[PDB]
Design a protein around this ligand. Structure first.
Ligand SMILES: *[C@@H]1O[C@H](CO)[C@@H](O[C@@H]2O[C@H](CO)[C@@H](O)[C@H](O)[C@H]2NC(C)=O)[C@H](O)[C@H]1NC(C)=O
Ligand SMILES: *[C@@H]1O[C@H](CO)[C@@H](O[C@@H]2O[C@H](CO)[C@@H](O)[C@H](O)[C@H]2NC(C)=O)[C@H](O)[C@H]1NC(C)=O
Ligand SMILES: *[C@@H]1O[C@H](CO)[C@@H](O[C@@H]2O[C@H](CO)[C@@H](O)[C@H](O)[C@H]2NC(C)=O)[C@H](O)[C@H]1NC(C)=O
Ligand SMILES: *[C@@H]1O[C@H](CO)[C@@H](O[C@@H]2O[C@H](CO)[C@@H](O)[C@H](O)[C@H]2NC(C)=O)[C@H](O)[C@H]1NC(C)=O
Ligand SMILES: C[C@@H](N[C@H]1CCN(c2ccc(CC(=O)O)cc2)C1)c1cccc2ccccc12
Ligand SMILES: C[C@@H](N[C@H]1CCN(c2ccc(CC(=O)O)cc2)C1)c1cccc2ccccc12
Ligand SMILES: N[C@@H](Cc1c[nH]c2ccccc12)C(=O)O
Ligand SMILES: N[C@@H](Cc1c[nH]c2ccccc12)C(=O)O
Ligand SMILES: *[C@@H]1O[C@H](CO)[C@@H](O)[C@H](O)[C@H]1NC(C)=O
Ligand SMILES: *[C@@H]1O[C@H](CO)[C@@H](O)[C@H](O)[C@H]1NC(C)=O
Ligand SMILES: *[C@@H]1O[C@H](CO)[C@@H](O)[C@H](O)[C@H]1NC(C)=O
Ligand SMILES: *[C@@H]1O[C@H](CO)[C@@H](O)[C@H](O)[C@H]1NC(C)=O
Ligand SMILES: *[C@@H]1O[C@H](CO)[C@@H](O)[C@H](O)[C@H]1NC(C)=O
Ligand SMILES: *[C@@H]1O[C@H](CO)[C@@H](O)[C@H](O)[C@H]1NC(C)=O
Ligand SMILES: [Ca+2]
Ligand SMILES: [Ca+2]
Ligand SMILES: [Ca+2]
Ligand SMILES: [Ca+2]
Ligand SMILES: [Ca+2]
Ligand SMILES: [Ca+2]
Ligand SMILES: [Cl-]
Ligand SMILES: [Cl-]
Lengths: 791, 792
């Protein structure tokens, strides 16, 4: 006969009912020293009584409506579960009694716990009795090979975990921790969330299991792992009662920084949503089912009375727990005078599910009632009769039930027995009028939209941590700027890293970089390694300051030479001084002008033209000059041997020799004007590799031997003072030439491109200048100052 | 139910065994009234288990001491591995208590964690002891919900720990998981995921299966298995819930993986088939420890459908064995020893022993109830119960405090969670050479009593991989990191597969699998392979150095020449024939030159503050002395312009001090610093000497050069006064050589590093002073060695 505290009402058809009027049982572990007696449940739950009242109201409204099942009445045998499996199981045993004078229940609306409903459906489905639950939302109840006769008016919990992952990815967090009740409601949900979050590149720090029967040390361990971690977001998948101990311990230890992502079961629970817990838990964003509309329901709630309820048996205990009677009292108080979750509501969510379940079973019964004897759902097109209806026929009609909810909706269960709905997203607020926690809706989750466009959050209503209004930071490691790269911290997950600076020559312009990048050769990483500033190029320039000095020196040399040439041109036909060789004079002067001009080739970038011309350019020009001044010496060879052609002919041997060398590189290995940087790695010199070294040596040596013979012959006879004994002058000249080159070799041996070229040009320009000077200074002086030209 | 094994007695036990493997797959669309479902495939192992229970019961009934005059009856049913059959059997068990709101006292068995949960939810309602023998889920240890559930099989958390330990023992880190979607696979796989994740082991994929998943789910699972690179696959499932996946695997011929079997299917007969074995090679599984039930086999060899009225399962057993009918009509004369079945083709009793132990434990609980004495009982006030009217909760209370010895001499004692622990044997699938059946050879041990870390013990010499090879396959996400490289993140992949990037020059990485390169200190530099660093190159002139050798020999030759000429004078040193000049000035100049030369001693090795801060000013003073001496050497027309010739000495001993002045300044203002510098080479450390005070060196050098310059001007302007070979010209040419050398040598000092800088400096000095000495003496020495014409 089941328990004695129950709600009961007769009728042709009887429906079952399991509601959590209490919260749990008295935890007195029977040591079995005596016969174990029936355990007792302890706490009270006004929400559960609201649900039971909703079911009773639905049945009464069905019995009152004249169209749905006329000339037939609905009865019920509603029991209490106290949220435990033992009570539900004894109740269901009282249900299926007559199967194998007692009424035979045809349908069961209840089992609000996914652990409770599992154990109930295991037993009901053995007799094929339809069980229409309203609040059990575990996914395991979708295995229609196990629970053959289980339907539910509440959506499955897959979309809830998906929505949790979507919310976490929307605020751009990647470091969270998960808590789930060690039950059939938290385990599968947390596993689904784990996979959905790992596929979205989200890292999970810790994962713990709790329960209302967990001892104190395990709660200590959980609080420790919560405190010892850096994750700010905590995804809780549990119900009110199985969460209350952890909340009490967290309030006692005063952990304040975290953010709670509430699941639907406890996001609106009065056990948790109280101010003293609110000050500590801070910000909670949770889900909620869609509201309902049961017109005329409040006026039914306001009529509950202990004496006017013979059918209802829990009304007495309700009166007691709400007024503390039997301190005996009157029984004529007002339910509106005290504030309890009973009528302190604005949106009916689970009560609407109970209403809908009762109405769906009534509609299946009507469907069986309005049959046509030819188009039935059973074998041979036959159909069943409502006077001897059995449970399996009602199950058959429920599987194919498809009707219209008074809100103008379509109600029809899937092939997995469940419905589907679109969640509201609420965020906990503190009412400035009362102090109580009030749930304000801030977002929506439509599950029909395509994957990726389902969530809609209105961020300006979310109140963060009570005061501030910017999204808190809950990443593992700080995201560091461009110029740096991620660096593995071994042991830690893929979301936690250090970041190391990029070396020079590599850059990174992106945030969250995986590696730095080498830029092309003529580019180089800048001072912040964020962008390769185009590199600089090494060579002498014309606007260059020291290049300016050099070029002005060259111009002055040419000016002096040409002006002296013109001054001669005054006396150019007064052989008074031209007792020397006129043509040799002009030739030497022009050779010097051109050698000077050669410096044109050392002030800018070398194209093959520039380099391979300039170098041999000096060669020929200076060699001409030297040979000319040399032949300027006494005619000893002429004395030893058809016009003076000889003199010209003489020079026009030596010259060719070196012109010879030029042509060789013209077709063997001409110098290469190319870019070189390997010795600087930051700036690219533009140098000119010698075409054939030893052949340059040969050239220079030939020239120096010509100069050396000139030197020897000018000195050895340097003491024959003819017209101021220019032997000595030219000797001193050739020696200056020697010394300059000598001393300047080192620099050429120990320097890069730029100053190498600069020193080379200085050397040449100045040496030729000195030659010209040493040869003319005296003569010009005398023929400008002492016009004593008779001998 | 109708078919059952029933025997009467004073005390009744219950049993639940999977005689069949499952029910006939047929979906009732409920067009008609549903009827009793039927079971399809036979299970000889379950029948051996049932026979073990019956054998234990009858043997206890035959013992004189254990339950002396009592009698044990039993009512054994079949679960068909489904929940509905078990639940209707249970409803048949609790009929006596159900009528409150043939009473059994205890039930032995569920065989399945789902069946166990569904049964214990109902049995714990009446406090009836349920002693399972194979239910190994961890959810049944929650004694707040399953009050009266005891099991004689170890829990399955140690099994997940053992699997993680095996994986980290064979050095794998890229694995994948498969689980049955029931109360046995899900908790085990979650526990293994935790245990692996804490050991830094990666899990590539994670799937769920069941015997009811249709072709598309299995195809998606096989796609996930194939499109991955993990070789090791852990499987937490039973035989039936794994058979479809195995069929699909053997059809698609996936033939590369390594299977880590859980206990349920490691020794299963549905999976251990020779045809499946070709593609499921290299199977490594767990097993319970063997038992000894003496006299069991002979009891098995007596089954017969006629002489078994208590047992009812014998008829279908014979029909399934001989494939007969009681199509060809059957006859009770066959030989159960002829056909080969999982019934009698066994070698170790592992789950039959658990049934034996469960029955014996219930018997010993009843015994403890029986040999109790008043005042020493366990119930209220020390009171004790009567065995002739024993109730279920009393046997439960006695079972919680049960402690006895097995037939093998071990201590059976249920933990406070109602489960006794045991070791694990570790087997590996082999192929029998004779017939061809799969043979399970024991290759390892797992002791749960040893401390964490030294529990596993594998014998590598017996494991054979893939049938032919004998080296452990490679199943890592990425190949290892060789020395000289470092790990590099791939943005999307998990932590255990990376890339290999090279350490830059200046950093090395000797360790394998290094997360970052290390920079060697100031003294060292990376190798070529960036493996270890070697010391950075030092930079300075050395004495054994070749060019240092050339320099030092030049210095020695200079000193030799000077000193030899000094001695040659010493011959004529008192013949003022040539000494018409100033004797003492002569000696002073010669000594100054010898010492300036000797100064070169300070440019051939590393500078200590001594060396640098002495050498530099060393040249200063020595050469300045020499210059002033030769200078004063010119006739003092200034002296005429101006008590002994002290004046001359005094003269010089002004100028000198000036520069000695400068020295003392750096002596206490900023003396040069002999330090190491490398920033311009980064590979070899020069050992240079930063100037103490630059502009003051400039002042010093300038003072010296102005002295030289006045000497030059005065020697030339009068360079045409040929007194004793007009040495005015000689000394002028000298001072000019000095000038030219310094001029031309400035550039190198301006454009070079340490080493050749010092070398050029020393060359310059040495040679210049040499030339001075020469230009001043060559002629005079020549004449007084060759033309001794000294009269005027
Ligand atoms: C925490 O880490 C995540 C990445 O794991 C960051 O999310 C990125 O945010 C930027 C800016 O919106 C996006 O461009 C990226 O696409 C995001 N990454 C991914 C994978 O979507 C997040 O910004 C970090 N949190 C903070 C405060 O910076
Ligand atoms: C799913 O959430 C969405 C959000 O409103 C609801 O879909 C809307 O319903 C109304 C009426 O059909 C339309 O005006 C909107 O256009 C719909 N939005 C979209 C994107 O289609 C819907 O009501 C929710 N699901 C249920 C069963 O109510
Ligand atoms: C599990 O672990 C070992 C088996 O390897 C058993 O301990 C050994 O038992 C024998 C005899 O009992 C001793 O001689 C050894 O010294 C033991 N070895 C160690 C390391 O202790 C142990 O008995 C097994 N546990 C059970 C319940 O059988
Ligand atoms: C696969 O990855 C693991 C992870 O390191 C490697 O394990 C290492 O193996 C060497 C050799 O014994 C050990 O010295 C290391 O200590 C191990 N690493 C860790 C963190 O324990 C393994 O070597 C890799 N597989 C192969 C074939 O190289
Ligand atoms: C401008 C100069 N040539 C310069 C530039 C190219 N050449 C050179 C020398 C040395 C090295 C490296 C080394 O050996 O250390 C590389 C190049 C020396 C020149 C012009 C005309 C006639 C010359 C007659 C005689 C010497 C020079 C002459
Ligand atoms: C050995 C030499 N001193 C050398 C070495 C140190 N000093 C120096 C010069 C220039 C720079 C950098 C720059 O300005 O480019 C750095 C150091 C020049 C010396 C010895 C004795 C008397 C001297 C009298 C006059 C000049 C030199 C004298
Ligand atoms: N889905 C919840 C049931 C539930 C929904 N809302 C609730 C509110 C309070 C308690 C329980 C619930 C479960 O599986 O347990
Ligand atoms: N322990 C398994 C059942 C099991 C163990 N060993 C077995 C051998 C054969 C069949 C089933 C089993 C479970 O929890 O369900
Ligand atoms: C709890 O922690 C917060 C952190 O600031 C602090 O403000 C508050 O005073 C603490 N309250 C108690 C009771 O410790
Ligand atoms: C309760 O008492 C009466 C009867 O219900 C009602 O009119 C009254 O408004 C209620 N009291 C309050 C404070 O609302
Ligand atoms: C049944 O479902 C269809 C569409 O699915 C809808 O048109 C109809 O209104 C539903 N109800 C009935 C009674 O057909
Ligand atoms: C199956 O896989 C194995 C290994 O690749 C190969 O030898 C064999 O040919 C494949 N096909 C069949 C039918 O076995
Ligand atoms: C047949 O039964 C008996 C056992 O007593 C014996 O002849 C023999 O063992 C059995 N046959 C075979 C092949 O074992
Ligand atoms: C259990 O039995 C053994 C053998 O009598 C004994 O050693 C032990 O003390 C007993 N009690 C416990 C708690 O083990
Ligand atoms: Ca309930
Ligand atoms: Ca990923
Ligand atoms: Ca609640
Ligand atoms: Ca780790
Ligand atoms: Ca079973
Ligand atoms: Ca099996
Ligand atoms: Cl509600
Ligand atoms: Cl076995």
């Amino acid at each position: 006969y089941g328990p004695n505290q129950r709600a009961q009402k007769k009728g042709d058809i009887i429906l079952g009912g399991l509601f959590p009027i209490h919260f749990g049982v008295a935890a007195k572990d029977q040591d079995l020293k005596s016969r174990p007696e029936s355990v007792e449940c302890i706490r009270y739950n006004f929400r559960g009584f609201r649900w039971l009242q909703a079911m009773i109201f639905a049945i009464e409204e069905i019995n009152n409506s004249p169209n749905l099942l006329p000339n037939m009445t609905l009865g019920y045998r509603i029991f209490d579960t106290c949220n435990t499996v033992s009570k539900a199981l004894e109740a269901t045993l009282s249900f299926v009694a007559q199967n194998k004078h007692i009424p035979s229940t045809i349908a069961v609306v209840g089992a609000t716990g996914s652990g409770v409903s599992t154990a109930v459906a295991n037993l009901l489905g053995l007799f094929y009795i339809p069980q229409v639950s309203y609040a059990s939302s575990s996914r395991l109840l979708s295995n229609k090979n196990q629970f053959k006769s289980f339907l539910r008016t509440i959506p499955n919990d897959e979309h809830q975990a998906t929505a949790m992952a979507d919310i976490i990815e929307y605020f751009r967090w990647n470091w969270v921790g998960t808590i789930a009740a060690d039950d059939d409601y938290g385990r599968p949900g947390i596993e689904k969330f784990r996979e959905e979050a790992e596929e979205r590149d989200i890292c999970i720090d810790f994962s713990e299991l709790i329960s209302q029967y967990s001892d104190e040390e395990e709660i200590q361990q959980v609080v420790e792992v919560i405190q010892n971690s850096t994750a700010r977001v905590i995804v809780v998948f549990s119900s009110g009662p199985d969460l209350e101990p952890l909340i009490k311990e967290i309030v006692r230890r005063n952990i304040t920084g975290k953010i709670w992502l509430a699941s639907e079961a406890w996001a609106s629970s009065s056990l948790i949503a109280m101010p003293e817990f609110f000050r500590v838990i801070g910000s909670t964003i949770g889900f909620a089912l869609k509201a309902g509309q049961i017109p005329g329901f409040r006026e039914f709630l306001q009529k509950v009375h202990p004496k006017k309820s013979a059918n209802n048996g829990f009304a007495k205990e309700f009166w007691e727990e709400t007024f503390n009677c039997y301190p005996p009292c009157t029984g004529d108080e007002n339910i509106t005078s005290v504030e309890t979750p009973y009528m302190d509501f604005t949106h009916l969510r689970i009560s609407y599910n109970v209403y809908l379940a009762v109405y769906s079973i009534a509609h299946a019964l009507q469907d069986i009632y309005t049959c046509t004897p030819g188009k039935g759902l059973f074998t041979n097109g036959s159909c069943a009769d409502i006077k001897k209806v059995e449970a399996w026929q009602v199950l058959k009609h429920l599987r194919h039930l498809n009707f219209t909810s008074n809100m103008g909706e379509q109600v029809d269960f899937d092939e997995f027995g469940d419905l589907v709905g679109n969640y509201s997203i609420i965020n906990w607020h503190l009412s400035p009028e009362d102090g109580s926690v009030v749930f304000e809706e801030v977002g929506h989750y439509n599950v029909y939209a395509k994957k990726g466009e389902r969530l809609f959050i209105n961020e300006n209503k979310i109140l963060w941590s009570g005061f501030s209004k910017e999204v808190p930071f809950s990443n593992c490691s700080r995201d560091c700027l461009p110029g740096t790269r991620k660096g593995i911290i071994e042991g830690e997950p893929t979301c936690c890293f250090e970041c190391v600076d990029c070396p020079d020559g590599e850059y990174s312009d992106e945030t969250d970089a995986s590696a730095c990048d080498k830029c092309p050769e003529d580019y180089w990483s800048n001072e912040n390694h964020t962008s390769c500033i185009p590199k600089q190029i090494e060579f002498l320039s014309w606007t260059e300051p020291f290049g300016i000095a050099l070029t002005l020196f060259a111009v002055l040399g040419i000016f002096l030479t040409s002006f002296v040439l013109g001054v001669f041109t005054k006396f150019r036909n007064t052989p008074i001084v031209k007792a020397t060789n006129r043509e040799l004079s002009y030739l030497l002067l022009f050779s010097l002008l051109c050698c000077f001009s050669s410096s044109l080739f050392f002030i800018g970038e070398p194209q093959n033209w520039t380099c391979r011309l300039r170098q041999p350019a000096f060669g020929i020009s200076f060699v001409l000059c030297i040979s000319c001044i040399l032949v300027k010496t006494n005619r000893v060879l002429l004395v030893f041997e058809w016009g003076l052609n000889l003199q010209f002919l003489l020079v026009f041997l030596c010259t060719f020799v070196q012109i010879v060398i030029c042509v060789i590189w013209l077709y063997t290995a001409p110098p290469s004007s190319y870019r070189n940087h390997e010795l600087e790695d930051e700036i690219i010199f533009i140098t000119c590799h010698e075409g054939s070294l030893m052949a340059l040596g040969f050239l220079i040596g030939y020239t120096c031997l010509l100069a050396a013979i000139c030197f020897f012959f000018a000195f050895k006879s340097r003491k024959l003072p003819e017209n101021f004994n220019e032997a000595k002058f030219i000797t001193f000249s050739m020696l200056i030439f020697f010394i300059v080159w000598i001393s300047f070799i080192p620099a050429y041996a120990s320097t890069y491109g730029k100053f190498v070229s600069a020193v080379e040009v200085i050397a040449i320009l100045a040496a030729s200048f000195g030659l010209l000077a040493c040869i003319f200074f005296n003569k010009v002086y005398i023929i400008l100052f002492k016009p004593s030209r008779n001998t």
